Amino acid sequence: PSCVFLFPPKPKDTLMISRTPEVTCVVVDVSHEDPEVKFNWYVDGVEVHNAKTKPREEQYNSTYRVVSVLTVLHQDWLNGKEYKCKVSNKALPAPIEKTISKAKGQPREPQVYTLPPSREEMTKNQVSLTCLVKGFYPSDIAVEWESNGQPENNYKTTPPVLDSDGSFFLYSKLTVDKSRWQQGNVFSCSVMHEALHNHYTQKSLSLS
Amino acid sequence: PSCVFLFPPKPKDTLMISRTPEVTCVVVDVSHEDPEVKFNWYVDGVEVHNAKTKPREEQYNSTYRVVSVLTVLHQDWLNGKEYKCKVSNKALPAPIEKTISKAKGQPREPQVYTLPPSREEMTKNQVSLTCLVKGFYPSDIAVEWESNGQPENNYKTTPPVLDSDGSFFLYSKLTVDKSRWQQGNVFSCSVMHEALHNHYTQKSLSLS
Ligand SMILES: *[C@@H]1O[C@H](CO[C@@H]2O[C@@H](C)[C@@H](O)[C@@H](O)[C@@H]2O)[C@@H](O[C@@H]2O[C@H](CO)[C@@H](O[C@@H]3O[C@H](CO[C@H]4O[C@H](CO)[C@@H](O)[C@H](O)[C@@H]4O[C@@H]4O[C@H](CO)[C@@H](O)[C@H](O)[C@H]4NC(C)=O)[C@@H](O)[C@H](O[C@H]4O[C@H](CO)[C@@H](O)[C@H](O)[C@@H]4O[C@@H]4O[C@H](CO)[C@@H](O)[C@H](O)[C@H]4NC(C)=O)[C@@H]3O)[C@H](O)[C@H]2NC(C)=O)[C@H](O)[C@H]1NC(C)=O
Ligand SMILES: *[C@@H]1O[C@H](CO[C@@H]2O[C@@H](C)[C@@H](O)[C@@H](O)[C@@H]2O)[C@@H](O[C@@H]2O[C@H](CO)[C@@H](O[C@@H]3O[C@H](CO[C@H]4O[C@H](CO)[C@@H](O)[C@H](O)[C@@H]4O[C@@H]4O[C@H](CO)[C@@H](O)[C@H](O)[C@H]4NC(C)=O)[C@@H](O)[C@H](O[C@H]4O[C@H](CO)[C@@H](O)[C@H](O)[C@@H]4O[C@@H]4O[C@H](CO)[C@@H](O)[C@H](O)[C@H]4NC(C)=O)[C@@H]3O)[C@H](O)[C@H]2NC(C)=O)[C@H](O)[C@H]1NC(C)=O
């Protein structure tokens, strides 16, 4: 009758005490007749009530997107607890359930290498600064770029890719004016992952 | 109850005359009590008759799967022709159609740059040779590594990532024993894409 979908928190929210990590239960295909759905949240089968149903929004196919959002503890998600979503109703014969948790296994620390642009990129107007991040488990990770403690926002990061040893890698690419790279400005690659000391490391990159 | 799935040809199959590119129409959850299936095929809305349809295959869940395969001309797919599979079935409300084509928009040449390992990495047993491929459109592309004309099979490539100018990039990572890199063996990164001359370029990498 209805498709239910359950989403983990963002990497960056579980790793920093100041941020707020949330699990997001999302029902699409809800027709006009049935208005309100009975969300029930459980942390290891044990019930918890810390919920918040975010009222509905309109759609281009006559159905409505009914969302719920459970705040969770940083150390609960990291330590691997099970987070069960249950949507009850009347227009469903039996009630639908969904269970997510952190991927299992020994966390592994990322190794973070910075890479300058290629000699052959050096003919262009904009150049490519590369941060290789490899050897990490699980795949949950965040990458950002800095110069003089100000965010550089002209970067893209690949999704994580499953390597031959069961660990993950990605590449982040920052594009900068060749003018900046030649003056000799320092650029930094910031990585946040559970297996890093204080969940944080940075590596600099500059023209040797 | 019946769902239709329509699969493009592989990137390499359309770029090389030697290969035979195919589009594939798969029908699933066909019923036991009403198993009669017809396929019609259209190329830019004009019907074509050369498709090769297989006999229905019983699955382990009391349902039939049926596959039809249309051979496409390389230049038709690269000229952006639309392939429509249409699937009919006596006991079904109305025919299920699906359409597929190469992604729309102007083609754009890949720039391929090779990157040696970070000196911070020149300490481990194994090092990472990096191939950066950026500025390409559409996202359909193939990447491989070699030394001395032999495939180097210890490689992983990222999926294509949408860059800020509307073009795609990715990276391919080749892991070699640190010793082979110190000797001075040449490694090569080859790329196939419709916007490259002869649909092909190769960029080599060695100790400097
Ligand atoms: C009516 O239309 C609506 C809306 O349509 C959409 O929006 C409109 C405006 C138009 O643009 C439409 O063209 C467009 O499609 C339909 O509602 C949609 O229903 C589909 C199902 O058909 C749902 O798709 C699922 O999506 C998830 C991924 O969703 C994230 O990423 C999307 C970005 O591409 C984004 O749209 C989503 O909102 C969502 O975003 C995340 O959400 C939270 C906030 O909610 C946030 O905290 C996150 O940070 C945010 N992240 C990002 C990056 O966006 C996808 O995973 C589902 O696929 C899984 O399940 C499938 C079937 O169950 C299966 O085919 C796949 O294999 C896949 O993976 C496995 O599946 C098994 C099988 O059950 C599963 O159990 C496993 O866990 C899983 N395994 C693994 C290892 O992963 C699925 O495809 C969308 O939720 C929904 N779209 C939107 C916009 O809400 C509605 O259905 C229409 N109705 C009709 C009748 O047509
Ligand atoms: C009864 O059994 C059958 C058969 O299953 C088999 O038998 C049972 C008993 C068990 O033994 C099973 O383990 C066994 O598999 C069930 O059949 C399945 O039904 C599901 C759907 O119900 C199908 O799902 C779709 O699969 C495709 C991907 O399919 C490729 O990869 C599969 C998994 O890796 C592989 O098994 C497939 O055969 C197929 O492989 C490809 O084959 C082609 C053709 O020859 C080949 O050239 C390719 O090389 C090859 N590729 C690979 C990698 O091998 C998946 O793409 C579908 O996803 C789309 O749609 C979803 C739902 O609509 C949606 O959630 C997704 O987001 C996605 O949507 C699309 O997204 C893209 C871009 O993002 C876009 O282009 C599209 O526009 C968009 N489409 C939308 C929104 O609609 C989907 O998951 C299985 O393939 C199918 N199994 C087989 C073998 O055919 C059946 O369901 C069972 N019945 C019941 C009642 O349970």
Author numbering:
A (entry chain B), B (entry chain A): 238 to 239, 239i, 240 to 444
Copy text verbatim from the article accompanying this structure deposition.
In addition, the insertions before and after S239 (i.e., C238i and C239i) showed a new feature: abolition of antibody-dependent cellular cytotoxicity (ADCC) due to non-binding of Fc gamma receptor IIIA (FcγRIIIA). In order to determine the structural basis for those findings and to provide a framework for further ADC engineering, we have analyzed the structure and dynamics of the Fc-C239i protein by X-ray diffraction and hydrogen deuterium exchange mass spectroscopy (HDX-MS). The crystal structure and dynamics of Fc-C239i with two different adducts, maleimide-PEG8 (polyethylene glycol-8) and cysteine, show how the IgG structure accommodates the insertion and binds the adducts, providing a model for the bound structure of one of the most common ADC linkers. In the two structures reported herein, a cysteine was inserted after Ser 239 (Fc-C239i) (for full sequence, see Section 2).
The two reported structures feature two different covalent adducts bound to the inserted cysteine. The cysteine-adduct and maleimide-adduct crystals diffracted to 0.23 nm and 0.27 nm resolutions, respectively. The inserted cysteine replaces Ser 239 and causes a 1-residue upward shift of Ser 239, Pro 238, and Gly 237. This enables Val 240 and all subsequent residues to maintain their wild-type locations. The new cysteine side chain points outward from the protein, into the solvent cleft between the A and B subunits. The new cysteine thiol appears accessible for conjugation to a linker/payload. The side chain of Ser 239 is now observed in the pocket formerly occupied by Pro 238, which has adequate volume but no H-bonding partner for the serine hydroxide. A wave of displacement then puts Pro 238 into the place normally occupied by Gly 237, formerly the last residue of the wild-type hinge. The observed location of Cys239i and the upward shift of residues Pro 238 and Ser 239 are similar in both chains of both adduct structures. The observed rearrangement of local structure adjacent to the C239i insertion provides an explanation for the previously reported loss of FcγR binding by Fc-C239i, by placing Pro 238 into the location where Gly 237 normally has an extended conformation that is incompatible with proline.
